[PDB]
Amino acid sequence: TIGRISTGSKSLDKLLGGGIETQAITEVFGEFGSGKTQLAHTLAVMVQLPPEEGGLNGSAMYIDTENTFRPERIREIAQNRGLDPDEVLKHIAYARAFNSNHQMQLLYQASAMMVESLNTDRPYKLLIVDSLTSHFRSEYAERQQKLARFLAMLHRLANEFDIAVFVTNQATLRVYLRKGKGGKRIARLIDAPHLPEGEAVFSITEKGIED
């Protein structure tokens, strides 16, 4: 049974078929400021909510490769969603990735953390990798070896722990993001085999992301 995490946006959830799916890797790509990082932050809060509110009562793991994680943004999203910001921050496991090899290494200390948490009322239900390729790009056919291997460990983790894997870039589900007018963002499903290739409009607000 696939679990779905609400993005915060009805329009975006509809395009995704209800939300980002567990046992799958959602890959969101676009230029900087396109909403990819705002969506990752909103998901780290949403996952924590009960299923009736668009969550999976789960914990989140935020792997950061380019200093994109902002706890005061988590605080804001949580506050404006009527949650305790301190409790929300508590169930978001932040790990910084210093290079591609350490990035892959973190998947293993993600597994260790996911086991200890499995028999709790808040097991991990989301693993964010913001961004997937930055270290691979800046360090290197080869690099293409070490990449599709990293994606393999991500899949193992998604199936192994019934977690949604959410990656940003510039797999399962590729979503192209772009800025719109005025401060709106536009999403577009790419090569989706089970969903139609439409578009959805969403806003970056105080609640993270919404219509």
Author numbering: 109 to 248, 255 to 284, 309 to 349
Quote from the publication.
We focused our attention on human RAD51, an ATP-dependent recombinase crucial for homologous recombination (HR) and for error-free repair of DNA double-strand breaks. We therefore explored the possibility of using a more stable orthologue as a surrogate and focused our efforts on archeal RadA from Pyrococcus furiosus, a protein that was already structurally characterised and is closely related to human RAD51.
Therefore, we proceeded with a stepwise humanisation of the LFDE site and validated the resulting mutants using biophysical methods (as described in the next section).
